[PDB]
Design a protein around this ligand. Sequence first.
Ligand SMILES: OC[C@H]1O[C@@](CO)(O[C@H]2O[C@H](CO)[C@@H](O)[C@H](O)[C@H]2O)[C@@H](O)[C@@H]1O
Length: 404
Amino acid sequence: GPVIRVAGDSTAVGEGGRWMKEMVEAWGKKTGTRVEYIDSPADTNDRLALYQQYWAARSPDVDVYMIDVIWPGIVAPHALDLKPYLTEAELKEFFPRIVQNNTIRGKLTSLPFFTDAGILYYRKDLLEKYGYTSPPRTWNELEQMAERVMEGERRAGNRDFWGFVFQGKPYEGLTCDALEWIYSHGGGRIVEPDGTISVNNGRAALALNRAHGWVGRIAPQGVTSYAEEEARNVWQQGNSLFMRNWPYAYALGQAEGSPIRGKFGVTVLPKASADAPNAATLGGWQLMVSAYSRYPKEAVDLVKYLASYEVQKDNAVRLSRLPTRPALYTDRDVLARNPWFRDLLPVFQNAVSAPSDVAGARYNQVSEAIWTEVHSVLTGRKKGEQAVRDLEARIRRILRHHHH
Ligand SMILES: OC[C@H]1O[C@@](CO)(O[C@H]2O[C@H](CO)[C@@H](O)[C@H](O)[C@H]2O)[C@@H](O)[C@@H]1O
């Protein structure tokens, strides 16, 4: 029979690739269909370029792709419209904001699979040891706590110990961290939903200068090369007070044999002041049937299975990744495993999207501009003031003649 081939997630990031292969194999066994899993690189922007080689070729060699929340406007021509395959009631079982993100000129490009939000991981054992009773609410507090805990852990012999790790590599992840920095200082959304390029302002500049001030001080010098997993591995070994990352890291830190099992919590990221908005970048992944698949019926069946209640449940319970179905947020087993899903639900509801809707098919290019200018601040090459001016000019060139 047909072989249904899937590219989605990466064995280089946590358990997501191993789990995705396992779910696809489970569907193949359940339906009696042959399946193959094709692995992907870690970083989302590398995966986009890989998948684009298949799409440019109209290649039938991959039937199902796991696509980023930032991709529908880019990838729509390469997606099979799923709208005729789902009833209205089936579609209403997902969060409507995500179904809307995935719908481009009326084409339902992809089913919501899991959502994502940037959060603050913190070592609660260490906060207690150093006399703090809550995690930091402001970035100034985060800095003060990091400096104090670092001084003590270094003095006690831990040469590897840092205050804060995050994603400072030049790739999409840095755009996500930087949107949080800027938005949490009252600096805006970089490009607003209405199209205004707003980034050249003093609050955004401050945000970026502040992040530079961490590098080599409370965060490792090498943080300018860290993606999700580089940060996570410093954290997970017990060597960081704080980490910014996504929900997937929680299950991994609780695993048997994790040095930090039972020693951490999560909360909203800090902000510049009490009247700034909370910032959590909205992420997440979707399930797309290739417009070039020779087997659309089977591929749609696999996509509906992966997006189903029990597979999203398994993703929540085993991998601590956030469902796209509201009903799972009231499931007793989901909540007992991950009580913080309830505690942070409003952080997840208020998450701020990167500017993929307004940049549309040009989002790749806009984000590359953001991460490169932000990286130039983190490296010390430019100050935030210069970087936000140069970034404004670059985004202006990229989006000239683009209407939304
Ligand atoms: O493969 C899925 C896996 O990717 C992550 C990052 O490791 O996705 C998040 O981070 C990306 C940026 O690096 C975002 O573009 C994406 O939207 C966001 O979901 C993990 O969180 C996720 O489990």
